Design a protein around this ligand. Structure first.
Ligand code: HEM
Ligand code: HEM
Ligand code: HW9
Ligand code: HW9
Ligand code: H2B
Ligand code: H2B
Ligand code: ZN
Lengths: 405, 404
């Protein structure tokens, strides 16, 4: 065997070796003494140039002009520009390539079979919070496409020396309010308590429902963030019903169609895009298992079990598992009926297996975070449970970044 | 740096300082994480410090850390190693080390029970025949007519000179898997290779789906010997469903006693190549993995059809629904048979309590998240939401090469 990690699939009995991991330039949180792979948050001058050069080489490889005159001219360009200004700027096609590659590189995304199919909106001309809003609105209109969802990213101006960042304060473009009660409970999404109160502090008149869509708090360089309300016609939502349990519709549950992450930093060739929201479509377990059944999210498991007349007084009745299955089915059924793209965890994980094969041949490996890739219900019923995975950081990358406040 | 470890459901944070006590490297590096891999990627002074550190662990455990008994025991160990290149454990040290190895086992969600472990000293064992007698005693004791009791039997340690004592079977109870001349399997596909080894060392096979394998037991540098387990010693549970009448008709069953018999127990640098241990099942091992793994009994489709589910399409969640009913049937059937089993909610709730116990007791607990989180309903259990640190402490249970 080679001195690259051996990766086994225990269902099929097949073996690969990950050589791509050698391309990692960035350390994760593990050491030989202890593994820290389960942590959610594993917390320039010449440094910039080498990252730039590496990225420029990656671009030229992908267009098969590596070593070419154009490749060598671009490198000189980059270093000349960095030499006189301290930074440099990407060509358009380099940005598109870098954005797809960041997605391709994202170890926590099971959706990566789709990585080559990404609409990249270039918004590097944006000069105000108002224009960020127009751009985001367009993104949302394009991406939503009346239920026939399309993966997209909008990229706003890069971080600059001593000038303020573009930031979207919201963690997603669509978030339901979380209202802290006098009794200490939360109405709405407890995930969004903090962003909800920031919105109120910045002048938003709050509602009082379980599903109030929040305004966007948008920040242009060195300015207070500005508040913007999404026209409700832009925000496609799906009311939830169950295919045979008629009373499920009476619960008044719903979810929005477009999962759009807005708090991550896109890093390309050492350049930092602090606002670069991206969207795809949901895997149904995200809604039906996590968002709805997490004890610290909507926490509806008991309510549903009571309605199904399950024995919630003992763990061994498996009342949680039964209720969770029906909530997931309701989500799938309801998105289907509504004609809103969604993928269940079996279809998603099967397609991620194909992705791993594609990447083994294309690049000799695929960075993957097992804990995230394996769905939160029915784990070993999906092929990825049985697949060993190697996790490592490649660039271009999406990274977590601190909250702006 | 000592890792900060967060629980995301409750927002609580701890610090793991137990990991500093690790002496053995796992497979990860700063460049890449290998925590999802099933198998680990890969002189007298070295034995002496392992031995001394384990002796220190032992006298600390009984509060006699610094006593005459302690100092004199270190001299004994040192004298023995320097003269002979090895040493031996007192029975009480063996009992302390076996519990500690369980306690330290990162893949075990049942560690709340770690202090309750019956240790059989089988170190005065000199033949395969004698191993069989000890194993029969273990099974009878651990089984206890359905009221299962955790146990370990410890056979003689490895010695520089000779071959190891080994039990060839991966468990004391295993169902045969018979390969057909078209590659396909009848019985348990996990056991194809052990089944052939049995037939080949002379066993007369059955042709059923749940034929209990005999044991291949090996004394040092001898051919292994075959021993049929007496039927009455192997308690099995027929599987039925509380509401689905047809479920029984599937003819499914599972055995009561989970006893791992291929792992090595390392205490104080000494190695016990045969030290089978048993507890009781968590229902998902049977209901989810053993029965629904595509490379195991793979029954999901059969049950789905019987439930008249829409099998034409994944998005009806037919797999999820059949798996739930199968786990329910295991739980129901074990309860009906009065055989100890724990469901995955109750087990993971106990493990959270264990974490807290261990944080106070030791300042950490090594845990392999991928193993601890159950194979159905992961995020429905608290352990999903709990960050974990994985690392190797000694005493340990380890994997070892297969004897053939
Ligand atoms: C095409 C439809 C897509 C599906 C079904 C999909 C699926 C998923 C799922 C299930 C997660 C885990 C989310 C969670 O547990 O909260 C995830 C995370 C991730 N996805 Fe994908 N994805 C898709 C498109 C995309 C696109 C277009 C990008 C970027 C261009 C992307 C990059 C990521 C990143 C960076 C994470 C980690 C987010 C974090 O750590 O907060 N995904 N995706
Ligand atoms: C008290 C009842 C017990 C319960 C409910 C329990 C639970 C579990 C579960 C669910 C697993 C993972 C099994 C799998 O996925 O196949 C496991 C693995 C393990 N358990 Fe426990 N356990 C118990 C007793 C014990 C005892 C008595 C020991 C040792 C004395 C032990 C040491 C281990 C070890 C070493 C592994 C890893 C096995 C391997 O890697 O193949 N367990 N146990
Ligand atoms: C593109 C796409 C497709 C499908 N689903 C999505 C939604 C992804 C939401 C991920 C949010 O993750 C949050 C909530 N749970 C762990 C935590 C991890 C995290 C932490 C931080 C500081 C930022 C961030 N983006 N993600 C996005
Ligand atoms: C004490 C107890 C309590 C509850 N369950 C059990 C049974 C545990 C059986 C674990 C067997 O694991 C096998 C089959 N699947 C992954 C694989 C890991 C492994 C590999 C090797 C070479 C040896 C070994 N013991 N374990 C034992
Ligand atoms: C502690 C643990 O890492 C967290 O609960 C992780 C586990 N796996 C996960 N997987 C995915 N896809 N999303 C998560 O939010 C998530 N949470
Ligand atoms: C590849 C991955 O590590 C294996 O499939 C793991 C995942 N988690 C697991 N968890 C448990 N408890 N037993 C397993 O056999 C198991 N298999
Ligand atoms: Zn790791």
């Amino acid at each position: 065997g080679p001195k690259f990690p051996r990766v086994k699939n225990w269902e099929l009995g097949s073996i690969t070796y990950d050589t791509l991991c050698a391309q990692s330039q960035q350390d994760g949180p593990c050491t030989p003494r202890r593994c820290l792979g389960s942590l959610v948050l594993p917390r320039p001058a010449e440094q910039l140039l080498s990252q730039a050069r590496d990225f420029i080489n990656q671009y030229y490889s992908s267009i098969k002009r590596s070593g070419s005159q154009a490749h060598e001219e671009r490198l000189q360009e980059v270093e000349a520009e960095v030499a006189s200004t301290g930074t440099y700027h990407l060509r358009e096609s380099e940005l598109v390539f870098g954005a797809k590659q960041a997605w391709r590189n994202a170890p926590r995304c099971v959706g990566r079979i789709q990585w080559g199919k990404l609409q990249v909106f270039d918004a590097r001309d944006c000069s105000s919070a108002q224009e960020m809003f127009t751009y985001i609105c367009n993104h949302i209109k394009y991406a939503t496409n009346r239920g026939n969802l399309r993966s997209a990213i909008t990229v706003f101006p890069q971080r600059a020396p001593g000038r303020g960042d573009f930031r979207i304060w919201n963690s997603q473009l669509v978030r339901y309010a979380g209202y802290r009660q006098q009794d200490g409970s939360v109405r709405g999404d407890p995930a969004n308590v903090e962003i909800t109160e920031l919105c109120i502090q910045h002048g938003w008149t709050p509602g009082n429902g379980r599903f109030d869509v929040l305004p966007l708090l948008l920040q242009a360089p060195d300015e207070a963030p500005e508040l913007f309300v999404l026209p409700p016609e832009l925000v496609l939502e799906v009311p939830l019903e169950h295919p045979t349990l008629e009373w499920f519709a009476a619960l008044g549950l719903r979810w929005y169609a477009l999962p759009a992450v807005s708090n991550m930093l896109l890093e390309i060739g050492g350049l930092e895009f602090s606002a670069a929201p991206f969207s795809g479509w949901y895997m149904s377990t995200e809604i039906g298992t996590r968002n709805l059944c997490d004890p610290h999210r909507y926490n509806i498991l008991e309510d549903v079990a009571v309605c199904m007349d399950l024995d919630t007084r003992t763990t061994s009745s498996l009342w949680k598992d039964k209720a969770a299955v029906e909530i997931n089915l309701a989500v799938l059924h309801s998105f289907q009926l509504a004609k809103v793209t969604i993928v269940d965890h079996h279809a998603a994980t099967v397609s991620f297996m194909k992705h791993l094969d594609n990447e083994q041949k294309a690049r000799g490996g695929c960075p993957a975070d097992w804990a995230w890739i394996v769905p939160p219900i029915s784990g070993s019923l999906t092929p990825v449970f049985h697949q060993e995975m190697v996790n490592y950081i490649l660039s271009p990358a999406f990274r977590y970044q601190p909250d702006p406040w």
